[PDB]
Amino acid sequence: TCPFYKKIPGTGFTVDAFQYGVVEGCTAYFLTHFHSDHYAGLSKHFTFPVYCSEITGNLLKNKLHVQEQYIHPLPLDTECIVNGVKVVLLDANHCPGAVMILFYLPNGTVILHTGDFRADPSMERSLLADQKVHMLYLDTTYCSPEYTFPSQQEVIRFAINTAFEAVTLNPHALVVCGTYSIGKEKVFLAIADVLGSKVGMSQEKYKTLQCLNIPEINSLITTDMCSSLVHLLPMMQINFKGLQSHLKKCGGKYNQILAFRPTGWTHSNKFTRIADVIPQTKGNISIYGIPYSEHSSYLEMKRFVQWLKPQKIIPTVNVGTWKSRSTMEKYFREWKLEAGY
Protein backbone atom coordinates (compact mmCIF):
# COMPACT_ATOMS: atom_id res chain seq x y z
CA THR A 1 0.00 0.00 0.00
CA CYS A 2 1.58 3.23 -1.34
CA PRO A 3 2.90 5.51 1.40
CA PHE A 4 1.52 9.04 1.97
CA TYR A 5 4.94 10.61 1.19
CA LYS A 6 4.63 9.36 -2.46
CA LYS A 7 1.28 11.14 -2.86
CA ILE A 8 0.76 14.75 -4.02
CA PRO A 9 -2.48 15.84 -2.22
CA GLY A 10 -5.29 17.39 -4.28
CA THR A 11 -4.19 15.64 -7.45
CA GLY A 12 -4.41 12.10 -8.88
CA PHE A 13 -0.57 11.95 -9.04
CA THR A 14 2.13 9.90 -7.42
CA VAL A 15 5.89 10.19 -7.56
CA ASP A 16 8.23 7.16 -7.78
CA ALA A 17 5.47 4.66 -6.89
CA PHE A 18 5.57 1.75 -9.30
CA GLN A 19 5.93 -1.17 -6.84
CA TYR A 20 2.39 -1.21 -5.42
CA GLY A 21 0.40 -2.36 -8.43
CA VAL A 22 -2.43 -0.04 -9.46
CA VAL A 23 -2.66 2.79 -6.83
CA GLU A 24 -6.33 3.62 -5.94
CA GLY A 25 -7.15 6.96 -7.62
CA CYS A 26 -3.88 7.63 -9.47
CA THR A 27 -4.32 9.08 -12.94
CA ALA A 28 -0.59 9.80 -13.56
CA TYR A 29 2.66 8.27 -12.24
CA PHE A 30 5.72 10.58 -12.17
CA LEU A 31 9.24 9.11 -12.32
CA THR A 32 12.02 11.46 -11.10
CA HIS A 33 15.00 9.51 -12.48
CA PHE A 34 16.07 6.09 -13.84
CA HIS A 35 17.49 4.31 -10.70
CA SER A 36 16.20 0.88 -9.73
CA ASP A 37 14.73 1.57 -6.28
CA HIS A 38 12.72 4.51 -7.81
CA TYR A 39 11.44 2.74 -10.98
CA ALA A 40 10.94 -0.67 -9.12
CA GLY A 41 8.01 -2.58 -10.76
CA LEU A 42 8.03 -0.79 -14.13
CA SER A 43 8.24 -3.13 -17.14
CA LYS A 44 6.87 -3.72 -20.67
CA HIS A 45 3.42 -4.63 -19.17
CA PHE A 46 2.78 -1.24 -17.43
CA THR A 47 -0.28 0.39 -19.05
CA PHE A 48 -0.89 3.84 -17.40
CA PRO A 49 0.76 7.20 -18.25
CA VAL A 50 4.32 7.76 -16.93
CA TYR A 51 5.56 11.37 -16.74
CA CYS A 52 9.35 11.95 -16.83
CA SER A 53 12.25 13.78 -18.56
CA GLU A 54 13.31 13.01 -22.14
CA ILE A 55 16.42 11.05 -21.05
CA THR A 56 14.36 9.06 -18.53
CA GLY A 57 12.00 8.22 -21.46
CA ASN A 58 14.75 7.00 -23.80
CA LEU A 59 15.72 4.63 -20.92
CA LEU A 60 12.22 3.34 -20.17
CA LYS A 61 11.76 2.66 -23.87
CA ASN A 62 15.11 1.03 -24.78
CA LYS A 63 16.14 -0.66 -21.47
CA LEU A 64 12.80 -1.59 -19.87
CA HIS A 65 10.87 -2.09 -23.14
CA VAL A 66 7.97 0.10 -21.99
CA GLN A 67 5.54 0.81 -24.84
CA GLU A 68 5.95 4.20 -26.47
CA GLN A 69 2.26 5.15 -26.00
CA TYR A 70 2.55 5.32 -22.17
CA ILE A 71 5.75 7.45 -22.04
CA HIS A 72 5.22 11.20 -21.73
CA PRO A 73 8.47 13.10 -21.99
CA LEU A 74 8.37 16.67 -20.74
CA PRO A 75 10.99 19.34 -21.35
CA LEU A 76 12.84 21.06 -18.52
CA ASP A 77 12.28 24.65 -17.32
CA THR A 78 8.96 24.90 -19.17
CA GLU A 79 5.43 25.48 -17.80
CA CYS A 80 3.36 22.39 -18.83
CA ILE A 81 -0.17 21.15 -18.08
CA VAL A 82 -0.93 17.57 -17.04
CA ASN A 83 -4.53 16.47 -16.25
CA GLY A 84 -5.55 20.04 -15.42
CA VAL A 85 -2.54 20.86 -13.22
CA LYS A 86 0.42 23.14 -14.01
CA VAL A 87 3.82 21.43 -13.53
CA VAL A 88 7.53 22.17 -14.12
CA LEU A 89 10.50 19.79 -14.14
CA LEU A 90 13.88 21.18 -12.96
CA ASP A 91 17.34 19.71 -13.26
CA ALA A 92 18.12 17.79 -10.08
CA ASN A 93 22.00 17.79 -10.48
CA HIS A 94 21.90 14.04 -9.59
CA CYS A 95 22.27 11.64 -12.62
CA PRO A 96 21.46 12.08 -16.32
CA GLY A 97 17.71 12.77 -16.75
CA ALA A 98 17.02 13.25 -12.98
CA VAL A 99 14.47 15.94 -12.19
CA MET A 100 12.76 17.90 -9.43
CA ILE A 101 8.97 18.48 -9.97
CA LEU A 102 7.08 21.74 -9.13
CA PHE A 103 3.28 21.15 -8.73
CA TYR A 104 1.03 24.30 -8.82
CA LEU A 105 -2.22 22.99 -7.21
CA PRO A 106 -5.80 24.16 -8.15
CA ASN A 107 -6.17 25.74 -4.66
CA GLY A 108 -3.09 28.10 -5.14
CA THR A 109 -0.79 25.68 -3.22
CA VAL A 110 2.74 24.97 -4.58
CA ILE A 111 4.66 21.72 -3.93
CA LEU A 112 8.27 20.85 -4.73
CA HIS A 113 9.35 17.23 -4.89
CA THR A 114 13.19 17.06 -5.10
CA GLY A 115 13.44 13.32 -5.96
CA ASP A 116 17.09 12.55 -5.63
CA PHE A 117 19.16 15.85 -5.87
CA ARG A 118 22.38 17.54 -4.88
CA ALA A 119 21.52 21.11 -4.00
CA ASP A 120 23.51 23.90 -5.76
CA PRO A 121 23.42 27.75 -5.68
CA SER A 122 22.46 27.82 -9.33
CA MET A 123 19.04 26.38 -8.36
CA GLU A 124 18.25 29.70 -6.62
CA ARG A 125 18.15 31.37 -10.08
CA SER A 126 15.36 29.21 -11.62
CA LEU A 127 11.53 29.14 -11.71
CA LEU A 128 11.69 28.14 -7.98
CA ALA A 129 12.73 31.69 -7.13
CA ASP A 130 9.46 33.18 -8.43
CA GLN A 131 6.97 32.05 -5.70
CA LYS A 132 6.39 30.56 -2.27
CA VAL A 133 6.60 26.80 -1.54
CA HIS A 134 4.08 25.35 0.87
CA MET A 135 5.32 21.68 1.04
CA LEU A 136 8.81 20.34 0.33
CA TYR A 137 9.41 16.67 -0.19
CA LEU A 138 13.12 16.40 0.54
CA ASP A 139 15.87 13.90 -0.32
CA THR A 140 17.37 13.44 3.19
CA THR A 141 20.05 10.80 2.30
CA TYR A 142 22.82 12.76 4.10
CA CYS A 143 20.74 14.70 6.72
CA SER A 144 23.35 14.62 9.53
CA PRO A 145 26.22 17.08 10.44
CA GLU A 146 29.01 14.58 9.88
CA TYR A 147 28.34 14.22 6.15
CA THR A 148 30.84 16.62 4.50
CA PHE A 149 32.30 16.07 1.06
CA PRO A 150 34.36 17.87 -1.62
CA SER A 151 32.89 19.35 -4.77
CA GLN A 152 32.37 17.18 -7.79
CA GLN A 153 34.84 19.52 -9.55
CA GLU A 154 37.66 18.97 -7.02
CA VAL A 155 37.25 15.16 -7.17
CA ILE A 156 37.28 14.90 -11.04
CA ARG A 157 40.42 17.15 -11.03
CA PHE A 158 42.20 14.70 -8.70
CA ALA A 159 41.26 11.69 -10.84
CA ILE A 160 42.33 13.37 -14.11
CA ASN A 161 45.78 14.29 -12.75
CA THR A 162 46.32 10.89 -11.08
CA ALA A 163 45.43 9.03 -14.31
CA PHE A 164 47.48 11.27 -16.61
CA GLU A 165 50.51 10.84 -14.37
CA ALA A 166 50.35 7.00 -14.17
CA VAL A 167 49.85 6.53 -17.94
CA THR A 168 52.65 9.04 -18.77
CA LEU A 169 55.04 7.02 -16.55
CA ASN A 170 53.77 3.76 -18.11
CA PRO A 171 51.97 4.03 -21.48
CA HIS A 172 50.86 0.36 -21.34
CA ALA A 173 49.04 0.98 -18.04
CA LEU A 174 45.18 0.71 -18.18
CA VAL A 175 42.58 2.71 -16.19
CA VAL A 176 39.45 1.09 -14.83
CA CYS A 177 36.38 2.89 -13.33
CA GLY A 178 33.70 1.10 -11.30
CA THR A 179 30.01 1.55 -12.20
CA TYR A 180 26.56 0.02 -11.43
CA SER A 181 23.88 2.32 -12.88
CA ILE A 182 23.69 5.72 -14.49
CA GLY A 183 25.36 8.61 -12.74
CA LYS A 184 29.04 9.22 -12.17
CA GLU A 185 29.66 9.23 -15.94
CA LYS A 186 31.53 12.55 -15.68
CA VAL A 187 34.27 10.72 -13.75
CA PHE A 188 35.12 8.34 -16.62
CA LEU A 189 34.35 10.61 -19.62
CA ALA A 190 36.57 13.32 -18.14
CA ILE A 191 39.49 10.88 -17.64
CA ALA A 192 39.19 9.48 -21.20
CA ASP A 193 39.15 13.06 -22.67
CA VAL A 194 42.41 14.17 -21.05
CA LEU A 195 44.08 10.88 -22.08
CA GLY A 196 42.95 11.10 -25.72
CA SER A 197 41.08 7.73 -25.54
CA LYS A 198 37.67 6.22 -26.07
CA VAL A 199 36.05 4.46 -23.12
CA GLY A 200 35.67 0.75 -23.62
CA MET A 201 32.72 -1.12 -22.01
CA SER A 202 30.29 -4.03 -22.43
CA GLN A 203 27.33 -4.04 -24.87
CA GLU A 204 24.56 -3.50 -22.20
CA LYS A 205 26.32 -0.41 -20.73
CA TYR A 206 27.22 0.91 -24.16
CA LYS A 207 23.46 0.82 -24.79
CA THR A 208 22.64 2.74 -21.60
CA LEU A 209 25.00 5.56 -22.61
CA GLN A 210 23.46 5.85 -26.12
CA CYS A 211 20.18 6.86 -24.42
CA LEU A 212 21.66 9.87 -22.58
CA ASN A 213 21.74 12.70 -25.22
CA ILE A 214 25.52 13.27 -24.86
CA PRO A 215 26.88 15.28 -27.81
CA GLU A 216 29.01 13.13 -30.19
CA ILE A 217 28.75 10.06 -27.89
CA ASN A 218 29.57 7.66 -30.74
CA SER A 219 33.06 9.24 -31.02
CA LEU A 220 33.72 8.83 -27.20
CA ILE A 221 32.78 5.13 -26.42
CA THR A 222 33.55 1.61 -27.75
CA THR A 223 33.20 -2.15 -26.96
CA ASP A 224 36.73 -2.69 -28.26
CA MET A 225 38.55 -3.43 -24.96
CA CYS A 226 41.78 -3.71 -26.99
CA SER A 227 41.36 -0.17 -28.56
CA SER A 228 40.71 1.56 -25.24
CA LEU A 229 42.81 2.73 -22.32
CA VAL A 230 39.82 3.51 -20.05
CA HIS A 231 37.40 0.61 -19.30
CA LEU A 232 34.25 0.32 -17.24
CA LEU A 233 33.41 -2.66 -15.06
CA PRO A 234 30.78 -3.52 -12.43
CA MET A 235 31.69 -1.84 -9.07
CA MET A 236 31.84 -5.30 -7.41
CA GLN A 237 34.73 -6.27 -9.69
CA ILE A 238 36.88 -3.37 -8.34
CA ASN A 239 39.21 -5.38 -6.11
CA PHE A 240 42.63 -6.97 -6.57
CA LYS A 241 41.22 -10.33 -7.77
CA GLY A 242 38.79 -8.86 -10.32
CA LEU A 243 41.30 -6.41 -11.73
CA GLN A 244 43.99 -9.15 -12.19
CA SER A 245 41.41 -11.42 -13.85
CA HIS A 246 40.36 -8.65 -16.26
CA LEU A 247 44.03 -7.78 -17.02
CA LYS A 248 44.57 -11.32 -18.37
CA LYS A 249 41.46 -10.99 -20.62
CA CYS A 250 42.78 -8.08 -22.80
CA GLY A 251 45.52 -9.95 -24.75
CA GLY A 252 48.74 -8.84 -23.03
CA LYS A 253 48.17 -5.26 -24.21
CA TYR A 254 48.45 -3.64 -20.79
CA ASN A 255 50.79 -4.57 -17.94
CA GLN A 256 49.34 -2.39 -15.12
CA ILE A 257 45.92 -1.18 -13.85
CA LEU A 258 45.00 2.01 -12.01
CA ALA A 259 41.39 1.80 -10.84
CA PHE A 260 38.86 4.13 -9.26
CA ARG A 261 35.89 3.53 -6.89
CA PRO A 262 33.43 6.45 -6.75
CA THR A 263 31.91 5.73 -3.33
CA GLY A 264 29.41 8.10 -1.70
CA TRP A 265 30.52 8.66 1.89
CA THR A 266 32.64 6.43 4.14
CA HIS A 267 34.31 7.26 7.51
CA SER A 268 37.57 8.89 6.08
CA ASN A 269 35.73 12.14 4.97
CA LYS A 270 36.05 13.07 8.66
CA PHE A 271 39.93 13.33 8.35
CA THR A 272 41.57 12.78 4.93
CA ARG A 273 41.57 15.81 2.57
CA ILE A 274 41.34 15.01 -1.18
CA ALA A 275 44.87 16.34 -1.89
CA ASP A 276 46.30 13.95 0.76
CA VAL A 277 44.68 10.82 -0.72
CA ILE A 278 46.83 7.69 -1.34
CA PRO A 279 45.79 4.34 -2.98
CA GLN A 280 45.91 0.74 -1.78
CA THR A 281 48.48 -1.11 -3.95
CA LYS A 282 49.25 -4.78 -4.65
CA GLY A 283 52.05 -5.49 -7.12
CA ASN A 284 51.14 -3.76 -10.41
CA ILE A 285 47.56 -2.84 -9.35
CA SER A 286 46.33 0.24 -7.48
CA ILE A 287 42.90 1.31 -6.15
CA TYR A 288 41.88 4.85 -5.21
CA GLY A 289 38.66 5.42 -3.26
CA ILE A 290 37.11 8.77 -4.24
CA PRO A 291 34.09 10.44 -2.57
CA TYR A 292 31.97 11.41 -5.54
CA SER A 293 28.48 12.11 -4.07
CA GLU A 294 25.32 12.66 -6.16
CA HIS A 295 23.27 13.84 -3.11
CA SER A 296 23.33 16.99 -1.01
CA SER A 297 25.87 17.17 1.79
CA TYR A 298 24.39 18.41 5.14
CA LEU A 299 25.56 21.99 4.52
CA GLU A 300 24.23 21.94 0.94
CA MET A 301 20.81 20.70 2.10
CA LYS A 302 20.63 23.15 4.97
CA ARG A 303 21.54 26.18 2.87
CA PHE A 304 18.96 25.12 0.16
CA VAL A 305 16.11 24.70 2.63
CA GLN A 306 16.92 27.96 4.43
CA TRP A 307 16.72 29.78 1.16
CA LEU A 308 13.46 28.10 0.15
CA LYS A 309 11.65 28.68 3.47
CA PRO A 310 9.07 25.97 3.03
CA GLN A 311 6.06 25.81 5.40
CA LYS A 312 6.24 22.06 5.77
CA ILE A 313 8.96 19.53 5.02
CA ILE A 314 8.34 15.82 4.33
CA PRO A 315 11.44 13.54 4.23
CA THR A 316 11.65 10.82 1.57
CA VAL A 317 14.81 8.94 2.79
CA ASN A 318 15.59 7.26 6.12
CA VAL A 319 11.90 7.31 7.02
CA GLY A 320 11.37 3.71 8.24
CA THR A 321 12.56 4.08 11.86
CA TRP A 322 11.52 6.40 14.64
CA LYS A 323 15.13 7.20 15.51
CA SER A 324 15.82 8.66 11.99
CA ARG A 325 12.54 10.51 11.65
CA SER A 326 13.07 12.10 15.08
CA THR A 327 16.69 13.03 14.43
CA MET A 328 15.76 14.80 11.14
CA GLU A 329 12.91 16.78 12.79
CA LYS A 330 15.50 18.10 15.29
CA TYR A 331 17.76 19.42 12.48
CA PHE A 332 14.85 21.00 10.49
CA ARG A 333 13.79 22.84 13.70
CA GLU A 334 17.44 24.09 14.26
CA TRP A 335 17.51 25.40 10.65
CA LYS A 336 14.21 27.24 11.03
CA LEU A 337 15.36 28.86 14.36
CA GLU A 338 18.75 29.89 12.99
CA ALA A 339 16.90 31.58 10.09
CA GLY A 340 13.75 32.87 11.85
CA TYR A 341 11.24 31.62 9.15
Rank residues 97 and 242 by Cβ distance to Ni ion and give the closer one. Answer: 97
CB of 38 to Ni ion, least distance (A): 6
Rule CB under 5 A: choose which of 14, 23, 51, 116 binds Ni ion.
116
Q: Does 118 bind Ni ion (CB under 5 A)?
A: no
CB of 119 to Ni ion, least distance (A): 14
Q: Does 231 bind Ni ion (CB under 5 A)?
A: no
- Considering only the stretches 116-124, 197-205, 224-232, 284-292, report the one whose residues sit in contact with Ni ion under the rule CB under 5 A: 116-124
Beta bridge pairs of residue 136: 112, 313
- Considering only the stretches 10-18, 53-61, 66-74, 111-119, report the one whose residues sit in contact with Ni ion under the rule CB under 5 A: 111-119
Contacts 24+ apart (CB under 8 A), 48-55: 48/22, 51/82, 51/87, 52/97, 52/99, 53/89, 53/97, 53/98, 53/99, 54/97, 54/213, 55/96, 55/97, 55/211, 55/212, 55/213
220 with 197: CB under 8 angstroms?
Answer: no
CA 166-283-158 angle, to 5 degrees, is 30
CB of 145 to Ni ion, least distance (A): 22
How many of the chain's residues bind Ni ion (CB under 5 A)? Answer: 2
* Among the listed residues 264, 303, 293, the one whose alpha carbon sits nearest the alpha carbon of residue 152: 293
- Considering only the stretches 52-60, 110-118, 137-145, 257-265, report the one whose residues sit in contact with Ni ion under the rule CB under 5 A: 110-118
Rank residues 31 and 238 by Cβ distance to Ni ion and give the closer one. Answer: 31
Q: Does 35 bind Ni ion (CB under 5 A)?
A: yes
Residues 119-150, buried b or exposed e (16+ Cβ, 10 A)? bbeebeeeebeeeebebbbbbbbbbeeebebb
- Considering only the stretches 20-28, 29-37, 49-57, 207-215, report the one whose residues sit in contact with Ni ion under the rule CB under 5 A: 29-37
Rank residues 254 and 292 by Cβ distance to Ni ion and give the closer one. Answer: 292
123 with 90: CB under 8 angstroms?
Answer: yes
- The site for Ni ion (CB under 5 A) is made up of 35, 116
